[PDB]
Amino acid sequence: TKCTLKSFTVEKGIYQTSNFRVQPTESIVRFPNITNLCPFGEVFNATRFASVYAWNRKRISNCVADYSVLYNSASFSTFKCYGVSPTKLNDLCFTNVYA
C-alpha cells in the first residue's frame, strides 16, 4: 500500500494495491513424438542447383528440424531473417516449411 500511494503514511480506508495471481509451478512441453531429421543436408549441400527462373521448391513436412547447423555453419555469406529470429527458431513448430 505504501508503495502504491508513494507515501510512508497511509490514511484510514481501503486501497487496491496489487493483484493476486497463482503462479505456475512447472512447465508443460508437448510436441508430436517423431525422431526423423529434416533433410536439410540434401537441400543446401546438393551438387546442382536450378536456374532462378525455374527455382526448385522442396516441401519439408513431418520431421524434427535442427536449425542449429544452419546458423552455426559459416559457409554462408548472407543470412537474414524476416518475421522471426534465428535464436527463437529451434523452439518453434511449423505446419510446413518450403525451401
Binding site: 490514511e11 484510514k12 480506508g13 481501503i14 487496491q16 508430436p32
Partner: protein, 167 residues
C-alpha cells in the same frame, strides 16, 4: 504456442481440422494435445484484486487483506461476497460503517485493539404507534444550525504547451 494457465478437461467438440480455440480477446481458449487428440481448456491462473483494509499509520500498523471475488481456497478467515477477508475478526454486533468493504460488509479498528469486520447497521429500529384515531403533535421545539459546504471554484491553472513540451 506458449502461455501460462490451468489445463483442464473440456466438453468442447472441436472439428477434426481445428487445432486451437480463441476467446473474444483473441487469446487461446483451448488446445488439442498433439500426442492425444483430446481438447483441453486453458483457464488463466486465478487472479483478482488485492485490497488492504487499514486504520491510518498514525494509529496502528495492523492490516487486513481482502482478496476480491475469490474463494478462501487458492489463497481468522471470513468469506464474504466481496471476496476472502483474511486478518479481520468477524463480529456479530453491527455498527455504523467506517471503512467500507462491500456487499454490506464494513471494517473498522476497535476492541487489545484489532481490525474487525461486520455487517453495517442501517439505523435504529423505531416502530410508530400508528392508529386510526391518534395524532402526535410536538409540544416543544429546538432551533438547530447546520453546516453545508459547497465547492465554488478550482485552481486556475495555465500550461505553456510549447515550453512544457519543448523547453
Amino acid at each position: 504456442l506458449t502461455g501460462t494457465g490451468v489445463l483442464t478437461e473440456s466438453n468442447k467438440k472441436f472439428l477434426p481440422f481445428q487445432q486451437f480455440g480463441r476467446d473474444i480477446a483473441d487469446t487461446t481458449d483451448a488446445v488439442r494435445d498433439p500426442q492425444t487428440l483430446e481438447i483441453l481448456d486453458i483457464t488463466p491462473c486465478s487472479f483478482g484484486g488485492v485490497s488492504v483494509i487499514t486504520p491510518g499509520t498514525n494509529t496502528s500498523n495492523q492490516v487486513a487483506v481482502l482478496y476480491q471475488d475469490v474463494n478462501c481456497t487458492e489463497v481468522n478467515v471470513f468469506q464474504t461476497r466481496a471476496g476472502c477477508l483474511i486478518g479481520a475478526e468477524h463480529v456479530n454486533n453491527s455498527y455504523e460503517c467506517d471503512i467500507p468493504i462491500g456487499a454490506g460488509i464494513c471494517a473498522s479498528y476497535q476492541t487489545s485493539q484489532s481490525i474487525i469486520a461486520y455487517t453495517m447497521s442501517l439505523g435504529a429500529e423505531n416502530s410508530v404507534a400508528y392508529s386510526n384515531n391518534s395524532i402526535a403533535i410536538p409540544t416543544n421545539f429546538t432551533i438547530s444550525v447546520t453546516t453545508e459546504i459547497l465547492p465554488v471554484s478550482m485552481t486556475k491553472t495555465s500550461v505553456d504547451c510549447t515550453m512544457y513540451i519543448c523547453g
